[PDB]
Amino acid sequence: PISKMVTAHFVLIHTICHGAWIWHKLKPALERAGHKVTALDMAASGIDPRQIEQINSFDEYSEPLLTFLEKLPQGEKVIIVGESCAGLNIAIAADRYVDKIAAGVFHNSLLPDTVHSPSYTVEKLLESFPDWRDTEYFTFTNITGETITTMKLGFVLLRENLFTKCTDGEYELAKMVMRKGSLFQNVLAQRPKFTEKGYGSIKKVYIWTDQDKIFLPDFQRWQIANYKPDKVYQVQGGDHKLQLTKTEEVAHILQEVADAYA
Amino acid sequence: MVTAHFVLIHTICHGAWIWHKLKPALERAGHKVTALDMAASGIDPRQIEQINSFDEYSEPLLTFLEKLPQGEKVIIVGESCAGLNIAIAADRYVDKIAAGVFHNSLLPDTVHSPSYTVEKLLESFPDWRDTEYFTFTNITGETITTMKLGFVLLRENLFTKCTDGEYELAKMVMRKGSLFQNVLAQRPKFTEKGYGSIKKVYIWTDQDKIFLPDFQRWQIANYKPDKVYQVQGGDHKLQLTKTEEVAHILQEVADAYA
Amino acid sequence: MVTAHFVLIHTICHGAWIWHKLKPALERAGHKVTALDMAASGIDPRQIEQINSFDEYSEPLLTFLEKLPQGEKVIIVGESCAGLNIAIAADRYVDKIAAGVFHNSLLPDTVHSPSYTVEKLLESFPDWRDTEYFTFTNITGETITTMKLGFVLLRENLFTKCTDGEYELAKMVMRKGSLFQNVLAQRPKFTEKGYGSIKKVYIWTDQDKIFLPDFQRWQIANYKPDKVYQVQGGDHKLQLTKTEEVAHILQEVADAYA
Amino acid sequence: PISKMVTAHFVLIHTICHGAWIWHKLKPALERAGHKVTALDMAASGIDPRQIEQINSFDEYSEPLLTFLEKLPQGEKVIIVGESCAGLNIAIAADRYVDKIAAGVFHNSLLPDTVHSPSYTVEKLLESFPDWRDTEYFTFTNITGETITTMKLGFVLLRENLFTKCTDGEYELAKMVMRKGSLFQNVLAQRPKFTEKGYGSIKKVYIWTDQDKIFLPDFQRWQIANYKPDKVYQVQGGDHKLQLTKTEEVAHILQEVADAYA
């Protein structure tokens, strides 16, 4: 009748332990479509200089995103794409900059809600996937005395559960730059719920595959049932790291999102 | 077929990650591979300002070699400035090294000071385009010049023929680095008994757009390697653009030296 | 008599060494004593430029307390700026601390930001005479001001009545330090449940020539300690000029709090 | 007939593992007499920023002394006072700056000679005192592949053998600032002998006590017999650290040295 195609500014946010580097194939694919893409390292992730023992909450961890949104020009809006635990970074960011977010895209991601604790989907994630195989755990005491659990993701868990169908070069890259991370789950349990006016009002698109071997179909479908997304896009095949195994397909879905919300 | 243990050493500002394609290639031939981050490089936790010389920068390689089990030998492959890491390492552990492989790399000698090929590189390629420079004073008071490689120089000179996913990765994890040139100028020359006695294989391509053809041929003429292999085409990052070729030359190095 | 485990914390630029007279004194009364070097202080191997905040500077104290065996409690004695180390530590390990003792020290509060008493010190004593200042940018981009304490300020203001052997020792091992004032200004206030709940003993002398009488009385008025002991005479380094007095007050703190 | 009293510039050099700090009582006592005193930290000692694993020989370790002598003004001369292993620093310095040295004073110190290897008195020291009790040993490989043995001096050895009669405050100070050190004995074994023209020509005064519990009377007297000092001053009592236990007495002997050579 009237067709529409839109170019957008995507901000890509990795999950804990990883960095901007997992977006190294999706970032060019999106730029081939003419989109502007920013891929940020969160605190103590990728080549960010901080160490995780200096970080005290998931909010503090999210500082690079919030700084970047604080600096966005007047009336510029971005679509925040977050993989895995980064749905929590999208929720933190939307309660401070609802204004600047055209949509949040959850890519095999935690989908927080406003009705329960911020730690709620992390609890459910761990109920669904309680054993992280050869992952190693550590702790430190944060700035107000909370015990924080950090982890060094195991290489078998990396191979078989996160990077299941990925290229040898991609899995090897992951071993060369993977760092420690934390869910800050007990500090999330103490956190104010996400608000209705900020995060609750954001458009939310949920991309996932039922071939994900760590965010399992049962968990993903429970999340979709728990907090209905505005749109759901299920990709066939691939693995947890769809921006590596299904890069073009994820780019085409993200075009659709830009058309609809940006 | 000799299977060998290869220790891969990235150049300044980079990290173990530039070998993410070459390490699986070599492991598919049954070789053992170790890819190390040097100090303040890749995900190493130190920042460049706490490193005071190229010998301190080499610490992850020297500690590795320090702990290598008795009677084990490795082939150390160094790209670009990492030939200085090979020479430093070879003077301390000549015993542990089956051969040094120089991959579009500086090839230090024993006759001139440690900074000599750095001076010659800078002479052949003096303008590093959009690279930015910084300085700090190290613990003994020397001014160290650091750099942040410019993205145009990365696109056109280092990663010339690389895939868009590889160039993007490079911009996502590249860090500041230093040649410690002036500290190298003050360093004792590499010894004959250590670095001079090591077997030396030089791999290059004439399509390298930063280690230019006449600098590499100068280097070969200045201090003749045991073997030179020239790969056709590719770019400076042959372990990315010609990964299988480099893996096949390294099988020949393994076969020749174990 | 309660014997106690005391953790002694020097101020910026100093090291565990300023307690070399007080630690034996206390050990002669059967107490256990730990004297720690903070980051980049005494013989700690780090340099000030790799430290990015006062919380990072406190790391040796926090690691110590992290590892303290379950159910053990300590009395932390902090001199001069080390009251900020007490407050940082108390918010993380309130449980492990029988009391904080402030020895001619900053006494932080919960109501105002962490830099408040630093601002007030600098207001009461703005000219640090021959002290030299330097700056570096920390990893998150803040400019940190460091200082090298001037020897006249050391002789007349800090070590006023100290022996010539003690003043000389001070010049032989003193290092650069930092208040990280601006990072403190951005830090969350000390909590009520942690630092606010700790028992607090304030020891001072009115002959202190850098933490002047009206600044110390201001501090006491601004955030009233559980107990204040005033030593007659001496100087800023009461653990050097009045070592036995300080040891006797610390026995009373041990008796009062274990 | 004619009496003479002279003021001198003393450069005080600590032994391995220690720093300029062991001179904190002798330096004021000498300044009370009107002398100029410089007390230097050698590489990786005292608050010197280098670590011992970055140091590759006893000569490199001696860099702060040599830099300081390179900077001495024209025709200025110093008396170098070295305790324990610092006689080797006096010997290194005298083969480069014989010109600038009025005398070398060996204070319960190694007394190198020119006829044997630089490591020779270290060998004899270890023959005489082979067990360093609770001392811990470590190694690293230096710049040309030599194995270097470093040590962290034990606290019992410190208490009973080096700081035998010292004050509690002095022994405690020593535990608070003692660092790792090395004899670099195998690199000294490979070193050119000390020369006759430089080090062999220096005036040499030997101060010692037979109450020293680590540089034992048998070793000290063997050294005196092996390379006759120009003057020997035996202090009664005290311990290894005569600049702490016999500070005034050592200062009075050093006045005598200044009168005679400076």
Return the amino acid letter for B29: A
Task: Residue D212: name the closest of D161, D253, D170 by CA.
Answer: D161
The residue type at A27: K
3-state secondary structure of D109: strand
**Token digits for D57?**
């020989």
Q: How far is CA C107 from the centre of its chain?
A: 9
Residue that is written with structure tokens 């220690």 in the block: D18
Annotated binding site of B for acetone: 11, 80-81
Burial of residue C172 (number of CB atoms within 10 Å: 0-12, 13-18, 19+): buried
The CA distance from D87 to D46, in Å, is: 18
Say if the Cβ atoms of B93 and D54 lie within 8 Å.
no
**Interface probe with B: pick from D55, D56, D138, D144, most Cβ of B within 10 Å:** D144
| Mutation for D interface: B50, B137, B139, most D CBs within 10 A | B139
Q: B61: burial class by Cβ within 10 Å (0-12, 13-18, 19+)? A: buried
Beta bridge partners of A81: A12, A105
Query: Could you write out the DSSP letters of every residue in A94-119?
Result: HHHHGGGEEEEEEEEE----SSS-TT
Which residues are CB-contacts of A73 (< 8 A; sequence separation ≥ 6)? Answer: none
Nearest Cβ partner for A145 among C55, C139, C194: C194
Which residues of chain A are within 8 Å of residue B169 when distances are taken between CB atoms? 21, 24, 173
- B170 by Cβ neighbours in 10 Å (0-12 / 13-18 / 19+) ranks as buried
Return the biggest CA–CA distance within chain A: 61
- Give Cβ neighbours of residue A154 (< 8 Å, ≥ 6 apart): A132, A133, A134, A135, A136
Q: What size, in residues, is chain A?
A: 262
C-alpha dist (Å) from residue B135 to A49, B143, B146: 18, 6, 6
| Bridge-based pairing state of the strands B5-9 and B74-79 | parallel
Annotation says D116 is catalytic: no
Q: Are A27 and A12 a contacting pair, CB within 8 Å?
A: yes
> In chain C, which residue's Cα lies nearest the Cα of B46?
C50
- In this complex, do B17 and A49 lie within 8 Å of one another by their Cβ atoms? no
Contact: B172, A23; criterion CB under 8 Å? yes
**Domains assigned to chain C:** 1-258 (3.40.50.1820)
φ, ψ of residue C100 in degrees (nearest 5): -105, 135
Which chain B residue lies closest to A38 (C-alpha atoms)?
B172
Q: Verify whether the Cβ–Cβ distance B139 to C49 is below 8 Å.
A: no
Please give the angle made by the CA atoms of A26, A30 and A35, to the nearest 5 degrees: 145
Dihedral angle sign, alpha carbons of residues C43, C48, C52, C55: positive
Question: Which among D24, D47, D169 is the nearest to C43, CB-wise?
Answer: D47
Catalytic residue among D45, D62, D84, D119: D84
Question: Could you tell me how far CA D12 lies from the centroid of its own chain?
Answer: 8
Q: Is D84 a catalytic residue?
A: yes
Contact C165, D25 (CB under 8 A): yes
Whether residue D4 contacts residue D32, with contact meaning beta carbons closer than 8 Å, is answered with: no
Q: How far apart are CA D137 and CA D151, in angstroms?
A: 4
Q: In what order do the strands lie in the sheet with D36-40?
A: D36-40, D9-13, D78-84, D101-109, D203-208, D231-234
Q: Which two tokens stand for residue D130?
A: 């082979």
Residues 6+ positions from C58 with CB-CB distance below 8 Å: C38, C39, C84, C85, C88, C89
Pairing of strands B143-148, B132-137: antiparallel
Supply φ then ψ for residue C117, to 5 degrees.
-75, -20
Phi, psi of D207 (to 5 degrees): -110, 135
Task: Give which of C139, C180, C193, C197 to mutate to test A binding, by max A Cβ within 10 Å.
Answer: C139
Q: Which residue has the tokens 């981050």?
A: B37
Nearest CA to CA, how far is C258 from chain A (Å)? 21
Partner-chain contact B17 A179, CB within 8 Å: no
Ramachandran assignment for A27, one of left (phi > 0), alpha (psi -120 to 50 degrees), beta (any other): alpha
Tell me the C-alpha to C-alpha distance, in Å, between residue A221 and each of B26, C44, C73, C254, D139: 41, 53, 49, 59, 58
Cite the DSSP H helix spans in chain C.
22-27, 54-57, 59-67, 83-93, 116-124, 151-153, 164-173, 181-185, 213-222, 238-241, 243-257
C94 to chain B, closest Cα gap in Å: 30
In angstroms, how far is CA B214 from the centroid of its own chain?
Answer: 19
Q: Do A145 and C91 make contact, defined as CB atoms within 8 angstroms?
A: yes
Among D150, D147, D133, CA closest to D43: D150
| Resolution of the experimental model, in Å, one decimal | 2.2
| Catalytically annotated residue among B41, B58, B80, B178 | B80
